[PDB]
Tab-separated table of C-alpha atoms in Angstrom:
chain	number	residue	atom	x	y	z
A	1	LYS	CA	0.000	0.000	0.000
A	2	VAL	CA	1.374	3.470	-0.842
A	3	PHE	CA	0.355	5.751	1.999
A	4	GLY	CA	-0.426	9.465	1.836
A	5	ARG	CA	1.739	11.630	4.118
A	6	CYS	CA	-1.072	12.505	6.544
A	7	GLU	CA	-2.681	9.107	6.367
A	8	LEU	CA	0.542	7.534	7.545
A	9	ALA	CA	1.073	10.219	10.170
A	10	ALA	CA	-2.387	9.424	11.540
A	11	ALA	CA	-1.795	5.672	11.588
A	12	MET	CA	1.604	5.977	13.216
A	13	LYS	CA	0.053	8.356	15.796
A	14	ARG	CA	-2.749	5.917	16.526
A	15	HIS	CA	-0.114	3.226	16.922
A	16	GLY	CA	1.663	5.128	19.734
A	17	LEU	CA	4.702	6.366	17.768
A	18	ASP	CA	4.314	10.114	18.469
A	19	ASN	CA	7.000	11.021	20.912
A	20	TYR	CA	7.848	7.393	21.357
A	21	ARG	CA	11.300	7.589	23.042
A	22	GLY	CA	11.212	11.336	22.580
A	23	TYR	CA	10.858	11.197	18.780
A	24	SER	CA	8.107	13.410	17.544
A	25	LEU	CA	5.718	12.191	14.796
A	26	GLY	CA	7.456	14.268	12.143
A	27	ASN	CA	10.647	12.176	12.595
A	28	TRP	CA	8.794	8.945	11.955
A	29	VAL	CA	7.081	10.260	8.788
A	30	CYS	CA	10.317	11.764	7.529
A	31	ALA	CA	12.102	8.462	7.968
A	32	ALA	CA	9.310	6.640	6.117
A	33	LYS	CA	9.421	9.043	3.227
A	34	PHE	CA	13.062	8.571	2.752
A	35	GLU	CA	13.289	4.829	3.526
A	36	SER	CA	10.502	3.615	1.257
A	37	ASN	CA	8.679	6.607	-0.198
A	38	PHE	CA	5.673	5.515	1.989
A	39	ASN	CA	5.288	2.166	0.160
A	40	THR	CA	4.740	-0.800	2.533
A	41	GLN	CA	5.939	-3.163	-0.214
A	42	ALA	CA	9.386	-1.625	-0.540
A	43	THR	CA	12.303	-4.151	-0.411
A	44	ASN	CA	16.003	-3.566	-0.949
A	45	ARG	CA	18.786	-6.015	-0.741
A	46	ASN	CA	22.083	-5.256	0.951
A	47	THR	CA	25.637	-6.319	0.154
A	48	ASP	CA	25.839	-8.442	3.246
A	49	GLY	CA	22.974	-10.484	1.869
A	50	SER	CA	20.452	-9.061	4.127
A	51	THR	CA	17.235	-7.317	2.901
A	52	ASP	CA	15.272	-4.296	4.228
A	53	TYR	CA	11.530	-4.489	4.247
A	54	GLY	CA	8.557	-2.178	4.438
A	55	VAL	CA	7.902	1.376	5.097
A	56	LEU	CA	10.670	1.605	7.629
A	57	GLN	CA	12.999	-0.673	5.821
A	58	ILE	CA	13.652	-3.064	8.711
A	59	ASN	CA	16.664	-5.333	8.213
A	60	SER	CA	16.540	-9.168	8.066
A	61	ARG	CA	20.039	-9.476	9.700
A	62	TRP	CA	18.556	-8.602	13.115
A	63	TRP	CA	14.867	-7.938	13.201
A	64	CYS	CA	12.906	-10.352	11.174
A	65	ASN	CA	13.117	-13.736	9.512
A	66	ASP	CA	13.261	-14.003	5.707
A	67	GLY	CA	14.719	-17.521	5.442
A	68	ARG	CA	17.644	-16.393	3.511
A	69	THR	CA	19.870	-14.391	5.865
A	70	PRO	CA	22.242	-16.856	7.551
A	71	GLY	CA	22.797	-15.863	11.035
A	72	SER	CA	19.645	-13.680	11.200
A	73	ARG	CA	18.554	-13.044	14.915
A	74	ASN	CA	14.801	-12.356	14.371
A	75	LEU	CA	14.579	-10.022	17.277
A	76	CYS	CA	11.037	-8.908	16.428
A	77	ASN	CA	9.866	-12.495	16.087
A	78	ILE	CA	8.165	-12.166	12.814
A	79	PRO	CA	8.487	-13.099	9.229
A	80	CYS	CA	9.824	-10.138	7.211
A	81	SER	CA	6.818	-10.444	4.844
A	82	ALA	CA	4.657	-9.308	7.736
A	83	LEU	CA	6.398	-5.915	7.378
A	84	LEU	CA	4.991	-5.412	3.844
A	85	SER	CA	1.319	-5.535	4.834
A	86	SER	CA	-1.116	-2.575	4.385
A	87	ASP	CA	-1.636	-2.877	8.197
A	88	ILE	CA	1.401	-1.178	9.738
A	89	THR	CA	1.016	-2.742	13.158
A	90	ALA	CA	3.882	-5.216	12.897
A	91	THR	CA	6.201	-2.466	11.428
A	92	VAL	CA	5.369	-0.211	14.307
A	93	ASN	CA	5.868	-2.875	17.071
A	94	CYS	CA	9.165	-3.844	15.567
A	95	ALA	CA	10.303	-0.191	15.103
A	96	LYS	CA	9.572	0.438	18.776
A	97	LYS	CA	12.070	-2.376	19.676
A	98	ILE	CA	14.658	-0.981	17.278
A	99	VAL	CA	14.475	2.601	18.560
A	100	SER	CA	14.760	1.377	22.184
A	101	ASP	CA	18.015	-0.414	21.349
A	102	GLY	CA	20.590	2.196	22.170
A	103	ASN	CA	21.197	4.353	19.074
A	104	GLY	CA	17.598	5.630	18.804
A	105	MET	CA	16.573	6.632	15.246
A	106	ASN	CA	20.196	6.665	14.192
A	107	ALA	CA	19.430	2.978	13.396
A	108	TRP	CA	17.780	4.468	10.274
A	109	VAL	CA	20.429	5.650	7.933
A	110	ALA	CA	18.023	7.818	5.875
A	111	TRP	CA	16.807	9.364	9.101
A	112	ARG	CA	20.362	10.223	10.204
A	113	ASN	CA	21.241	11.600	6.818
A	114	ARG	CA	18.054	13.303	5.766
A	115	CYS	CA	15.863	13.956	8.716
A	116	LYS	CA	18.024	14.418	11.704
A	117	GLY	CA	18.418	18.086	12.631
A	118	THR	CA	15.965	19.259	10.051
A	119	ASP	CA	12.561	20.828	10.646
A	120	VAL	CA	10.732	17.537	10.838
A	121	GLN	CA	7.500	19.151	11.969
A	122	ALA	CA	7.063	20.078	8.308
A	123	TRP	CA	6.169	16.408	7.695
A	124	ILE	CA	2.926	16.580	9.662
A	125	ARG	CA	1.979	20.109	8.640
A	126	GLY	CA	-1.565	20.408	7.450
A	127	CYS	CA	-2.546	17.076	8.827
A	128	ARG	CA	-5.613	16.551	10.788
A	129	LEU	CA	-4.352	14.748	13.848
């Protein structure tokens, strides 16, 4: 599913991501824009053989099982395909584990490079939340 900016903002908000670990909603939406362009079906393979899945581009090396990443840890206890669903619930639950892990949103390279230190509030501007 390709979400609209505000539609995603509203689902992430409903899912308890606003200010989750001190990260305002705009951060979350910014990261999604840059990681997958708001498409839940986005996949991208990495050099190490791992693959990133979904709107937040969660990696199969640590977070989810895809059956083809040797030495995967499956910390979120889910099949990576679950992360491509139109229902963002599994993405959200798993992102909450990731962000709690120590480096915060820096786990998201596009966030670090494209969102971090920018006026992220722009991402939820005009939205009815």
